[PDB]
Amino acid sequence: MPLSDSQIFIALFIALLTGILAVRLGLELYS
Amino acid sequence: MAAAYLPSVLVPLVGLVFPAIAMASLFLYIEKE
Amino acid sequence: SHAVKIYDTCIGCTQCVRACPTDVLEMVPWDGCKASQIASAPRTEDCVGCKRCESACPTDFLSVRVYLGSETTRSMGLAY
Amino acid sequence: SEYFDLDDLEDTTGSWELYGQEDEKRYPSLQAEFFNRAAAPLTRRESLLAFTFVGGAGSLLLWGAKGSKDVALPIQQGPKKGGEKGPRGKI
Amino acid sequence: RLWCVQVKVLRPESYWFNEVGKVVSVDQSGIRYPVVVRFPTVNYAGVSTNNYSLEEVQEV
Amino acid sequence: MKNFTTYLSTAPVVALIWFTFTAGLLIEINRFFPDPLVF
Amino acid sequence: KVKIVVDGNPVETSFERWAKPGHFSRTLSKGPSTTTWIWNLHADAHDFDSHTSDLEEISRKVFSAHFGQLGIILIWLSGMYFHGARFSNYEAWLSDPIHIKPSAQVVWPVVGQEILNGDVGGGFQGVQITSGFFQLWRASGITSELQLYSTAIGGLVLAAAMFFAGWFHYHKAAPKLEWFQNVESMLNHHLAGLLGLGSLAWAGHQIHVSLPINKLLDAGVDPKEIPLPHEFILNRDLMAQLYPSFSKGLAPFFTINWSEYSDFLTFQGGLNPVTGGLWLSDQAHHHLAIAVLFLVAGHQYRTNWGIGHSIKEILEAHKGPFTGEGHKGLYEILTTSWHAQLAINLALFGSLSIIVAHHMYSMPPYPYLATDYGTQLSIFTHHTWIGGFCIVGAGAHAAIFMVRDYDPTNNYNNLLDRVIRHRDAIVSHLNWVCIFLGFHSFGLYIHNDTMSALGRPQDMFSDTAIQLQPVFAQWIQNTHLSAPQFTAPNALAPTSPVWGGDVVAVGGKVAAMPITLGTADFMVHHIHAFTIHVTVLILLKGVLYARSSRLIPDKANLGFRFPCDGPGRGGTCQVSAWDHVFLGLFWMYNSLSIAIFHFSWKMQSDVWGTVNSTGVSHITGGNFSQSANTINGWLRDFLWAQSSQVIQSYGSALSAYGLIFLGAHFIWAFSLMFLFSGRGYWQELIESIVWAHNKLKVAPSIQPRALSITQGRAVGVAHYLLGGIATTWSFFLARIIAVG
Amino acid sequence: WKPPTLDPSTPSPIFGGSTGGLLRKAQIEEFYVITWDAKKEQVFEMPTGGAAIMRSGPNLLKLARKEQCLALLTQLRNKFKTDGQIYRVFPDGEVQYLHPKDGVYPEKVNAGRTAVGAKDRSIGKNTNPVAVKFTGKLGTYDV
Amino acid sequence: QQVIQPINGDPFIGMLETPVTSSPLVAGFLSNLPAYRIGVSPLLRGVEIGLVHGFLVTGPFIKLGPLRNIPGVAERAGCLSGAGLVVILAVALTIYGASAFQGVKTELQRDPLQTADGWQKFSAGWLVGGLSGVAWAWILTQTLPYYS
Ligand code: CLA
Ligand code: CLA
Ligand code: CLA
Ligand code: CLA
Ligand SMILES: CC1=C(C/C=C(\C)CCC[C@H](C)CCC[C@H](C)CCCC(C)C)C(=O)c2ccccc2C1=O
Ligand code: SF4
Ligand code: SF4
Ligand code: SF4
């Protein structure tokens, strides 16, 4: 049984939040 | 696959748009006096 | 710029000064050796880092030492 | 004498204009006026980067979603021969 | 210390560390490295002589 | 003759003679005793 | 006034300096302190101008060394004739040159190596040879081992004469410097006397010996029943039987009735259909015409009778508005610098060897050479390699001249001075040309490989897709095919079958045929242009910047051969002109490897093969035009497919090639340890090893050193070249011997 | 002795020009001038490549690098037995006298010079790199 | 007679005056290019240069692109590809200006092009001229009589 469109969008949104946290860590490590 | 249009959007984004932005911004950062 | 430090084993033979292609080195009076002179490095802003001076030095181990440092237009030997 | 300390350091260092000529009158007035108002919003470096970014990204995703289908790129048609057959009876 | 006496080099950065050379002369004017020593082998620069302090050589 | 024998005592001439002797010895052993694998 | 001038007994003949290694050098004569002295003795042995600055002594050394080289060459040649006389199947091959493989080396039975004595035919076992001596001996008219023995004995006598002359002209009667500087006399004598009389004498041999014997051989007479050459000398009626104009004797020559001699001085063109070689009568007429032209050419220069040219006057007259003082000062350079002469002569001699390779494959001058595919491939490849090495040497000795013999006082606003004064323009323009050529030659292959992998053959550069036809070369081919009709009317046939026309077949195998050129040929020719231009860039940049650069302004004071000027100025490794020779050798290797690969694949695919009723079955079946437009095509269909013979050669007579294939791969890889590393590491490792020897009291007195930086580079490039070239050698020879 | 002043009215050697001379760096960063007094008119080798003719009397030559000036000066001193002076010239017009810095060549010991870079120890007495961690010094030679 | 001389008579500036550099035809032709009109505004010189270069790049894209064998689609695809290249070069010109700008005699005023603001107007002119030239190339493939 395949995944739904909503599951892919959920994963992409959680990854976008994780990427925001990553940018935050990278900027903190920089300065 | 579900949402099968997504590769046709994200592959140009990650392969062309993001690298162009990245090298333009990084060029501007590393040449800044 | 490169750092050129002189040590006290120098016998004042002047060979490093003659070897230098950018006039970094010069002989100054001293009382530590028989020749009554010691190499000095007052112009390391012009030092390219070729280590011709170290090749010229006869003491064991070397009495002139070149420590390659931050690179400049002069130290990179650029004419452009 | 190819050296002079002041008022001729440009000639001493060879800072010459070999081909550039001073000229104010090249283009017609209406043509110029048209092109200054055409390229006026892009005379700021942030606006041109924003314009080229938005236009290029939109052209690229519009190509990927729709334009690649319209020109019948093979990656958009997909397979029609049923799949390549592997060894050992594998699919 | 004597002329032409064997000495052992104790300078660690010297090519002839722990080796035995021959005293050529000793400067008597109070210079920093007065003992001139000749060696049977050349170093990496092709040199066979070097100057040492009194504490840098040991009479053998 | 002394100078000539000194030349024959130079390192490559001695190497040539010694290795000719050693190679010839090995070749003639393998000619007289063909295919030795074991003792 | 041109005259003989020598010094009597200048150097005593004694073994005293034989007992003193390094006697020739002031630095080396004191003997070693370290192992570096051992290498320096060999590296400096033939550097005469380093030993002394006296031009007379240098010139005498060069003259006598040349005699020594000639003696060595004559020993080698006499050896080849002797091995033909004693250890060969030459007479059997003469009776049957289509089925019998030439062999002139036989191995002794020990440690199993007698498997290398292959069953080559003619009741004979031996190593198959690819030098082409049998075809050359047959063209000369040699029919017996006795004549091969006679040439071998005469060669050894002449070899002894050359060695006597070198001793004599160094130790007894050494010519003075003004004798050597008689360049006008030397040019007159070498043009008229060496080349002109050499060609005339060889035309004499061809007419009186090679023509009748080969005519009888191609008629089918048994070689043992052919009359000996002196029978054709002594019996004019016997020669008139084969060439009826000989009955008139020398009277047609002296009455300018030269057209009577048309039976043996011909202009047929093309190839003899019996043998696949050029007509020997054409060769006789060619060598006669060459002899006359060179005999005239040797009367240009003034020596002692007023008439003639002064070379200095000619050079000083040729100057123009673009070029300042023109060729002024070049006569002084070329009469005082041996290195300038060596640079010129190496450049032209190497270019000549390469031209020889192309002309001999296309117009095979020896009978049964063209269907001996191993011989054809071998001689093309060999002469190509000799040419490339000589050209790299030309670059080296040009640079050595620039460092050691150049004098700015004698070159003010002449051509050399003006070339130096715009070296940046020359090098930058050549750099751009090399980048453009690399992009638009190799990137076409990369485009094709990528298109083919993506399943888009219609987007490829190919004969069945986007075409790149070499239309200029195709037009040249058509012009040379049509030449006997209009532009060379008295020539019966074109110079070569490669231009067009019919297959020349010998013994059911193709000797020569038209070589068509399509898209793959366009692409590989632009590869050749690219690789040659890059090699030129490296060598020419080494020459132009040998004395100075913006980086190192006093480079001439550092010499021709030095490792670097230290890690400063960013790092100056390999700035020397010697290091430019070092890099140019690699690019010469790359270039010539692609050239000989192009040759091997194109001949196997499009020329060589067997003839049937239907047509020609080529060795690799025309697959060059199908796959040589991709790198994967080269890797699979040339390298992978054709290496099957060398890697399956074990247990056959070709197994030596399989072993050499592996060993050459090894030697090539071994070279990378020298090229990729640096001597500081090795010197420290030697310090630890020396500690171990000191502990056991086995340390040598000659203190071990790592190789110098320059020697590390020289060892690396020598083993790289040896390994790569011997790999291709074994691959080629196993392949073409097994499938030819 | 006082540092000499660069005379801009000095003639240049006779040269036909080359591609090896000054570039944009002379306009925007710095360039160099070597002056010398020639005993006679003669040919010398340019450090940038090519033959040039030095004029009898004072000569002036502008060059891109200090090393080029010192290479030419080495040639003048060893081949023509001629002394010379080297200046550094800045785009704002400032001229700095370089060589010989105190009127005496640096290989000849001269009173009034002070040692810089001197270490009152042999080179094997330098401390360990662990001892200069987190100090900001360039290395063990710096202390 | 000699036709190669030092640049402006100065033997020590690293350049030579040759017939290629300093023929009246070459120096006259180069002076009238829009790059060398020092007093003319950088925006309009950018417009002219962009028109020229955006027009010319469409040709290889039309005749050699992946869709070159599809009638009608070939021209539109080649022109869209040329427009993409023009936009990429506009970005390159803009980031050049932001980084590169942070006397001259024949006395001459320096080029307004060689400033940050002047280069940004040049980049805007390049973009407008380049897109216009690409559009005109497409119009020409739709209207030229002997186009094929
Ligand atoms: C495991 C992966 C990893 C981790 C944990 C780090 C961690 C760090 N890096 Mg390293 N980096 C990586 C991969 C990584 N990097 C790779 C693959 C490269 C290319 C070889 C680099 C090259 C690099 C440079 C050149 C610099 C760092 C710096 C940093 C620090 C700040 C990063 C930041 O986001 O600044 C965010 C800052 C900005 C977005 C504006 C400034 C742009 C900076 C100067 C350059 C971009 C840095 C970024 C990490 C590059 C990513 C490379 C990408 C291909 C993955 C931080 C300690 C920076 C630091 O200051 O050194 C301690 C620094 O200058 N990194
Ligand atoms: C993941 C990265 C990526 C992607 C998604 C593409 C996608 C594409 N490439 Mg490939 N390319 C890439 C990386 C990529 N490229 C790299 C790294 C190289 C060098 C190794 C190449 C080398 C290459 C060549 C040599 C060619 C392509 C071409 C193509 C096109 C083939 C499909 C077609 O038929 O279009 C037909 C084309 C059209 C229908 C017109 C498309 C016009 C686009 C949409 C304009 C977009 C505006 C632009 C991006 C603005 C940039 C702004 C800013 C982001 C900088 C397609 C647009 C071919 C071509 O057609 O492109 C010109 C072509 O000849 N590429
Ligand atoms: C007709 C006269 C003549 C001929 C045929 C030659 C031929 C040759 N010369 Mg030249 N020479 C001549 C006149 C001649 N020379 C004059 C007048 C001068 C002074 C201006 C020179 C100065 C000169 C120098 C400085 C050198 C030569 C060298 C050579 C050789 C070139 C390499 C080659 O192709 O070898 C082909 C080899 C052969 C074909 C083998 C047979 C050669 C025969 C035996 C020699 C015939 C020429 C000789 C002069 C005859 C005199 C006999 C003698 C006993 C007096 C070749 C042997 C070079 C060299 O190799 O010499 C050692 C070299 O360095 N020559
Ligand atoms: C395969 C190995 C290799 C490659 C690719 C090169 C590359 C080059 N050599 Mg090097 N060389 C090599 C082996 C190689 N060398 C070795 C082993 C040595 C040691 C002896 C040297 C020593 C050497 C010397 C001494 C010189 C060179 C020079 C050159 C250049 C020739 C000009 C040219 O063709 O530009 C064109 C570039 C190529 C043909 C490389 C392939 C380019 C591909 C096809 C283009 C792909 C673009 C890509 C798709 C776009 C980017 C996308 C990506 C970022 C996502 C080129 C950069 C010469 C040079 O500098 O003169 C100008 C020069 O003087 N080489
Ligand atoms: C391996 C290597 C070495 C080490 C190699 C050395 C020292 C050469 C050794 C050659 C021979 C084997 C040394 C011994 C020669 C004697 C004559 C041996 C006598 C013994 C008899 C058996 C013949 C370097 O010195 C070096 C230097 C610079 C760049 C790269 C390298 C490099 O790669
Ligand atoms: S490294 Fe070179 S430039 Fe620096 S002081 Fe030593 S010799 Fe002079
Ligand atoms: S540092 Fe060395 S070369 Fe220089 S004067 Fe002292 S001993 Fe001589
Ligand atoms: S790495 Fe070797 S060649 Fe390069 S500068 Fe250092 S010592 Fe010289």
As a three-state string, the secondary structure of chain I is CCCCEEECCECCECCEECHHHHCHHHHHHHHCCHHHECCCCHHHHHHHHHHHHHHHHHHHHHHHCCCCCCCCHHHHHHHHHHHHHHHHHHHHHHHHHHHHCCCEECCECCCHHHCHHHHHHHHHHHHHHHHHHHHHHHHHHHHCCCCC
Measured CA to CA, the distance from residue I80 to residue D70 in angstroms comes to: 14
Query: Is ligand 3 within 6 A of the CB of residue G338?
Result: no
Residues of C in contact with E45 (CB under 8 A): 55, 57-58, 60
Contacts of G321 (CB under 8 A, 6+ apart): I1, I2, I3
Is E5 in a helix, a strand, or coil?
Answer: coil
Ligand 3 proximity of G160 Cβ (cutoff 6 Å): no
Closest residue (by CA) to atom 8 of ligand 7?
C13
SS3 helix, strand, coil % of chain F, rounded to 5? 75, 0, 25
Say which amino acid occupies C49: G
Distance CA H33, CA D2 (A): 11
- The rounded distance, in Å, linking the Cα atoms of I8 and I22 is 10
Pocket test for ligand 4, best of G587, G672, G676, G719 (most atoms within 8 A of CB): G587
Q: F8-30 b/e with 16+ CB inside 10 Å = b?
A: eeeeeeeeeeeeeeeeeeeeeee
Peptide bond into C61 cis (omega under 30): yes
| Distance of CA G702 from the midpoint of ligand 5 (Å) | 14
Q: Give the containing element (helix H, strand E) for C4.
A: strand C3-6
Closest residue of chain C to E12, computed from CA coordinates: C61
CB of residue A28 inside a 6 A radius of ligand 1: no
Two tokens, residue G123: 């009741």
Judging contact as 3 or more Cβ pairs under 8 Å, the answer for F and D is no
- With contact defined as beta carbons under 8 Å apart, do G512 and G504 qualify? yes
**Helix, strand or coil for residue G6?**
strand
Return the residue of G nearest to C74 by Cα.
G569
Contacts of G465 (CB under 8 A, 6+ apart): G457, G458, G459
I90:D52 CB<8 A: yes
Contact indicator for I54, I134 with CB cutoff of 8 Å: yes
* Closest by Cα among G120, G12, G60 to G738: G120
The rounded distance, in Å, linking the Cα atoms of D24 and G343 is: 58
Contacts of I3 (CB under 8 A, 6+ apart): G321, G322, I18, I19
Please enumerate in sequence order all residues whose Cβ is within 8 A of that of H78, keeping only pairs 6 or more positions apart, or say none. Answer: none
| CA distances in angstroms from I47 to D20, E48, G37, I54, listed in the order given | 18, 75, 70, 10
G124, G89 Cβ separation under 8 angstroms: yes
3-class secondary structure for G447-498?
Answer: HHHHHHHCCCHHHCECCCCECCCCHHHHHHHHHHHCCCCCCCCCCCCCCCHH
What are the tokens at G495?
Answer: 């110079």
Note if the bond before H100 is cis, omega within 30 degrees. Answer: yes
Kindly report the backbone phi and psi dihedral angles of residue G276, in degrees, each rounded to the nearest multiple of 5, phi listed first: 75, 5
CA distance H92 to G351: 56
Nearest to G381 by CA among G413, G352, G358: G358
Q: How far apart are CA A20 and CA A13, in angstroms?
A: 11
Token readout for D86 is 């592997």
Looking at the complex, report in whole angstroms how far the Cα of residue D12 sits from the nearest Cα belonging to chain B: 29
Per DSSP, the residues of G598-610 read HHHHHHHHHT-EE
**What are the beta bridge partners of residue G242?**
none
DSSP state letter for C3: E
β-bridge partners, E36: E25, E51
Query: Please, are residues G71 and G166 in contact by the beta-carbon 8 Å criterion?
Result: yes
Contact yes or no for G112 and F31 at CB 8 A? no
Q: How far apart are CA G182 and CA G647, in angstroms?
A: 56
Q: Is the CB of B16 under 6 A from ligand 2?
A: yes
How far apart, in Å, are the Cα atoms of H59 and each of H20, H33, I31?
A: 19, 10, 36
Are residues H34 and H84 in contact, defined by beta-carbon separation less than 8 angstroms? Answer: yes
* Largest CA-CA distance found in chain G, in angstroms, rounded: 92
Record: contact C3-H142, CB cut-off 8 A: yes
In ligand 1, which atom is closest to the CA atom of A30?
Answer: 31
What is d(CA I91, CA I93) in angstroms, rounded to the nearest whole number?
5
Q: Has F28 been labeled as part of a binding site?
A: yes
Where would I find the H helices in chain C? 15-19, 52-56
- Judged by a CB distance cut-off of 8 A, whether residue G680 touches chain C is no
**Residue C20 assigned to a binding site:** yes
Q: Are G468 and G523 in contact (CB under 8 A)?
A: yes
| Structural contact between residues G22 and G28, judged by C-beta atoms closer than 8 angstroms | yes
Name the burial class of residue G372, with classes exposed (0-12), middle (13-18) and buried (19+) by CB atoms within 10 angstroms of its CB.
buried
Residue H8 in contact with partner chain D when CB distance is under 8 A: yes
Please give the helix or strand (H or E) that residue G680 lies within, else none. Answer: helix G679-695
Which chain F residues touch G45 with a CB distance below 8 Å?
none
Three-state DSSP state, H116: coil
Phi-psi region of G548 (alpha: psi -120 to 50; beta: other; left: phi over 0): beta
Interface of I with G in 62-121 (CB under 8 A): 64, 66, 69
C-beta of G193 in contact with ligand 3 (< 6 A): yes
Q: Is the CB of A29 under 6 A from ligand 1?
A: yes
CA distance G15 to D23: 85
Task: Check if I84 has its Cβ closer than 6 Å to any atom of ligand 2.
Answer: yes
Phi, psi dihedrals of residue G177, rounded to the nearest 5°: -65, -40
Q: Is E58 helix (H, G, I), strand (E, B) or coil?
A: strand
Among protein residues, the one with the nearest Cα to ligand 8's atom 4 is G573
Positive/negative CA dihedral, G318, G323, G324, G326: negative
Cα gap G276→G512, rounded to integer Å: 8
Burial group, residue E55, by CB count within 10 angstroms (0-12, 13-18, 19+): exposed
Task: State both tokens at I43.
Answer: 């925006």
Q: Which residues of H touch D15 (CB under 8 A)?
A: 27
CA-based torsion, I39, I41, I42, I47: positive or negative: negative
In angstroms, the CA G494 to CA G488 distance is 9
Collapse the DSSP code of H15 into the 3-class scheme (helix H, G, I; strand E, B; otherwise coil) and give the result: coil
